[PDB]
């Protein structure tokens, strides 16, 4: 650490606080992630030390990882702005669809890259997904979930969010996929078009019921076996479906096409970043450059 100057807190992290900070010798203008007692376990240091080689333009850099005095920081590419504040400033107007359009679609390479090396990120949410200058957008803290776990609540008490959450993990499926990332990247998806989010659940119950209103409750003919997993309860209301011309207005056809695909029940039949890239959707993609001010 005595190779750097915090220049500010930035942020309070999953796993401990966010400082931005210089390298002394270099000059490098650096993202710290502190990860919050007996040492950092051998298995954590190892998974870690894998995601320093899954490197894509669109995954925030793993520079380094520093372990000393049995504390633990991550050293990551520093990006100015993140979704969820580009969505509340937005919020007046909207982002507009070709740089929606431009967004996930990078999102899509970063998780295709990702899951072809079958890692997971486990917890995308707006705060994760960090944007430059340049029109980029790009996945934070990508892999750390199976170094470290995902708590109920990080080191500051914050409550992680349920919204983004696929629906196999609040059922107790104990070995889910890459799907689950595009789940997340769906509501997303949905949040950025409609400027609410989609799934705003404030426990597992209400994530479930919230995901169950929108899309119906999930039966045996949509989802084979999900009557079978670990938290599904018999006794679920019985909602039916919305149509996602309700739920997404005024996406159009193919975007509707698309995010009906992200949002499938079955993680089997739920689209692949791989196939997500080919959808019509992305046809007249472009990569507009945002209005950002820092
Ligand atoms: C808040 O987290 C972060 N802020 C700015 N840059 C980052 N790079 C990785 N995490 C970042």
């Not at 992290?13 to 203008?29: D, H, Q, S």
Request: glycine share 6%.
């Amino acid at each position: 650490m005595e190779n750097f100057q915090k220049v500010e807190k930035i942020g309070e992290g999953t796993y401990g606080v966010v400082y931005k900070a210089r390298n002394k010798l270099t000059g490098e203008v650096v993202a710290l992630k502190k990860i919050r007692t007996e040492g950092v376990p051998s298995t954590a240091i190892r998974e870690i030390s894998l995601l320093k080689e899954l490197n894509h333009p669109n995954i925030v850099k793993l520079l380094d990882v520093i372990h000393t005095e049995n504390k633990l920081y991550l050293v990551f590419e520093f990006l100015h702005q993140d979704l969820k504040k580009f969505m509340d400033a937005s919020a007046l107007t909207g982002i507009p669809l070709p740089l929606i359009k431009s967004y996930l679609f990078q999102l899509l390479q970063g998780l295709a890259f990702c899951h072809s090396h079958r890692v997971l990120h486990r917890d995308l949410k707006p705060q994760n997904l960090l944007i430059n200058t340049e029109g980029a957008i790009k996945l934070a803290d990508f892999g750390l979930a199976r170094a470290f776990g995902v708590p109920v609540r990080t080191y500051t008490h914050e409550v992680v969010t349920l919204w983004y959450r696929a629906p196999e993990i609040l059922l107790g499926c104990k070995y889910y996929s890459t799907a689950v990332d595009i789940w997340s990247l769906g509501c997303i998806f949905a949040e950025m078009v409609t400027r609410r989010a989609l799934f705003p659940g404030d426990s597992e119950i209400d994530q479930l019921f919230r995901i169950f209103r929108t899309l119906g409750t999930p039966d045996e003919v949509v989802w084979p076996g999900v009557t079978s997993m670990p938290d599904y309860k018999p006794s679920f209301p019985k909602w039916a479906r919305q149509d996602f011309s309700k739920v997404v207005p005024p996406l159009d056809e193919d975007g509707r096409s698309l995010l009906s695909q992200m949002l499938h029940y079955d993680p089997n039949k739920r689209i692949s970043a791989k196939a997500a890239l080919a959808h019509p959707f992305f046809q007249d993609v472009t990569k507009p450059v945002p209005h950002l001010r820092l």
